[PDB]
Ligand binder design. Structure first.
Ligand code: HEM
Ligand SMILES: [Mn+2]
Length: 462
């Protein structure tokens, strides 16, 4: 298996083909999960846990079967089957007495990452995230029905010594254009690393294109040999970040309002204040390409910041620019910068009674108990999720503006002390203004953990 480039899944042979037969879904290509049940488990007895996992492997489809289902849906509107994802924590490997993946963030666990990420202390996390977690189960589908069915089958197999220490439910949100959004109202999950050549072709043929931004990512950017598997040369897994992030929509919308007022913004153009925080409008037109919304036919991703090196269109500290400078970061060569990028597979949680894109005042938005079940696959947690959160988002110095100044923290997910930032009131011009206050932190980490999704052959071998 060649991990140095993308893979053409349809014409893969030999080991690469085997790898696909033994890989879980949702990794090389996201699985539909508009209804998602998340189950965190505790292992009371090692032998019983191994038996449980073995039975789970029986309910699991491979990456390749999933891909076929995807192709079938496009071709013939076929529905496909549910997603059963299985991850193990370092502690869960210890309970099983099995050789574990060696990523040091994985080994230490998310509770140990609290200091370097500037996370709230573990004592401030929700109760179930304070407990020792051995495993996560992901049950996902387009609709609630088959999730209920799958849950019953999982239950059937579950022994009493495998406890459920916690559960979450994901509910996908969409706008009128049919694009998925997060609670602040913005199209989310547009920009993804593409590991499959067929996905890169699709992106080229059916979106704005891939002329300016190449979304390709080598297999090594997500896949890891499964160390305890019968044959790590063909049996692969991936590291998995789960973090429950609460969104105070109310405060975020007040923040949009106050920044607009601060910058003298007027009329509908007041919406651009929000775009400055995120890097896209709600719809989400890239702020680096347009001063206003409307480019969602379809939502584009074919852009870089090479004509925006001064940040006068999209500010340096906008969320997507902080988290993917697209070669403009200034700290390392573009070819190395992009190695920190990762596959995001999150799902929103919570129910609300307001259309997230409706024209409503901030007071009518929820302030808690909705948000994002942030999820991602990494081949190297320290160099991908943690790098992005710590070295980019939380870092006041990054990315490097040509004038050598510090743009400050990512306003959407930045953690730690914040200060007022600078913005360009006039799109594409050199006028600069310093807000009267820092953007308030409207996202709160409620608890999370690190896992590894092992190969199917490993799970069967237990
Ligand atoms: C509640 C928390 C979060 C919210 C509301 C949020 C929102 C968004 C939105 C609206 C976009 C633009 C749509 C897209 O390109 O997919 C985006 C993109 C992105 N986000 Fe976040 N996000 C959150 C958490 C995170 C975290 C924790 C990370 C990493 C530590 C992250 C990394 C990224 C990356 C890498 C992109 C794509 C950037 C690009 O390639 O242009 N996000 N996010
Ligand atoms: Mn807005």
């Amino acid at each position: 298996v060649d991990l140095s480039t993308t893979l053409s899944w349809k014409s893969a042979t030999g080991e690469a083909a085997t790898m696909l037969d033994e890989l879980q879904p949702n990794i090389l290509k996201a699985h539909v999960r508009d209804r998602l049940t998340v189950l965190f488990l505790g292992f009371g007895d090692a032998a019983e846990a191994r038996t449980f996992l073995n039975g789970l492997s029986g309910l699991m489809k491979s990456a390749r079967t999933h891909l076929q289902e995807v192709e079938a849906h496009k071709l013939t509107k076929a529905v496909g089957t549910p997603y059963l994802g299985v991850g193990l924590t370092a502690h869960g490997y210890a309970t099983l007495g099995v050789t574990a993946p060696a990523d040091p963030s994985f080994t230490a666990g998310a509770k140990a990452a609290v200091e370097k990420l500037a996370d709230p202390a573990v004592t401030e996390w929700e109760g179930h995230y304070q407990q020792t977690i051995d495993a996560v189960l992901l049950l996902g589908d387009a609709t609630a029905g088959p999730v209920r069915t799958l849950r019953r089958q999982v239950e059937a197999l579950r022994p009493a010594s495998v406890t459920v220490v916690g559960e979450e439910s994901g509910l996908g949100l969409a706008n009128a254009n049919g694009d998925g959004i997060e609670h602040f109202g913005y199209v989310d999950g547009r920009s993804q690393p593409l590991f499959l050549t067929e996905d890169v072709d699709a992106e080229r043929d059916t979106t704005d294109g891939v002329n300016d931004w190449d979304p390709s990512a080598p297999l090594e950017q997500v896949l890891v040999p499964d160390p305890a598997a019968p044959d790590p040369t063909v049996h692969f897994g991936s590291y998995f970040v789960f973090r429950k992030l609460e969104q105070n929509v109310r405060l975020f919308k007040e923040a949009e309002r106050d920044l607009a007022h601060d910058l003298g913004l007027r009329g509908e153009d007041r919406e651009r204040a929000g775009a400055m925080l995120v890097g896209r409008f709600e719809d989400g037109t890239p702020l680096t390409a347009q001063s206003a919304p409307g480019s969602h036919h379809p939502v584009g991703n074919d852009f870089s910041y090479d004509s925006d090196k001064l940040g006068q269109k999209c500010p340096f500290h906008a969320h997507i620019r902080k988290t993917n400078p697209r070669g403009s970061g200034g700290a390392e060569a573009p070819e190395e910068e992009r190695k920190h990028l990762m596959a995001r597979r999150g799902q929103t949680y919570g129910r609300r009674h307001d259309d997230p894109n409706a024209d409503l005042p901030p007071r009518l938005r929820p302030a808690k108990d909705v948000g994002l079940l942030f999820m991602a696959f990494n081949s190297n947690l320290g160099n991908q999720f943690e790098f992005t959160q710590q070295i980019w988002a939380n870092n006041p110095a990054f990315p490097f503006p040509p004038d050598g100044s510090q743009p400050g923290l990512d306003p959407v997910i930045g953690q730690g002390a914040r200060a007022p930032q600078k913005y360009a009131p006039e799109w594409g011009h050199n006028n600069v203004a310093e807000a009267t206050d820092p953007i308030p932190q409207a996202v709160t980490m409620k608890g999370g953990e690190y896992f590894f999704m092992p190969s199917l052959a490993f799970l069967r071998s237990l």
